[PDB]
């Protein structure tokens, strides 16, 4: 589980740079958030090719899914959340081995 | 049908970026629409190389054919519509398996 959580790069970007902000909603389109994830991945993880189509559905399943409303153009938009820049900050709004272990059974035999 | 509609990149681009604007006809050449589709695909889907001629026939077969009028240049032109940029938005101007489902074949089936 720890290894899987470590491999979840999108969740790491979201928890490190994406925050909810009722004070400054600053509605972003989905492509903007995708490009922000792409440059974060290139600058923090590895310079690699990025596909916005995939990242749309990955982002539509992460902890941000609840914030994805519909634009007047019926386009996917991240509502009520702020993408933090390089220095922006959060603001208001064992078992026993003493014997022959090869014969060990679980506590319920 | 849903899968095919999702796979239709041109229709999605037309819905997202191409909207009618009778108040400002702003005649565009077919090559401008193709370039707009190319940049939209690069920024919103994937960095891809597209043959502009194929997009030309696809647009000629698209829903914009009624707006794809004829110019004095003897070339097809998008008329009466506005190509929205990234920051532009809309502006004024089951059956019942009782007991044996394998024997199910009623008259309507």
Q: Please give, one letter per residue, the 3-state secondary structure of chain B.
A: CHHHHHHCHHHHHHHHHEEECCCCCCCEEHHHHHHHHHHHHHHHCCCCCCCHHHHHHHHHCCHHHCCEEECCCCCEEECCEEECCCCCCCCCCCCCCCCCHHHCCCCCC
CA dihedral A74, A80, A83, A85 (to 10 degrees): 130
Q: Mention every residue, 6+ apart, whose C-beta is less than 8 A from residue A22.
A: A80, A93
Which candidate from A51, A72, A75 shows the least CB-CB separation from B46?
A51
**In this structure, how many other beta carbons lie within 10 angstroms of the beta carbon of residue A105?**
6
Which DSSP category does A68 fall into?
E
A31, B46: Cβ pair inside 8 Å?
A: no
Nearest CA distance, B106 vs chain A (angstrom): 40
Cross-chain residue pair A53–B43, CB shorter than 8 Å: no
User: Among residues B28, B16, B11, B9, which one has the least CA distance to residue B85?
Assistant: B16
Name the token pair of B102.
């394998």
* Burial class of residue B80, CB neighbours in 10 A (0-12, 13-18, 19+): middle
Experimental method: cryo-EM
Indicate yes or no: CB of A49 within 8 angstroms of CB of B47.
yes
């Amino acid at each position: 589980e720890a290894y899987r959580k470590s491999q979840d790069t999108l969740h790491r970007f979201i928890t490190e740079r994406v925050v909810e902000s009722p004070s400054a909603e600053t509605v972003y389109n989905l492509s903007e958030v995708v490009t922000a994830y792409a440059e974060w991945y290139n600058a923090n993880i590895n310079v690699k090719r990025h596909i916005a189509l995939e990242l749309s559905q990955e982002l539509e399943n992460s902890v941000l899914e609840k914030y994805l409303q519909w634009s007047p153009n019926k386009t996917r938009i991240l509502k009520g959340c702020r993408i933090l820049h390089k220095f922006e900050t959060l603001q208001p709004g064992i078992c026993e081995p003493k014997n022959k272990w090869w014969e060990w059974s679980p506590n319920p035999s």
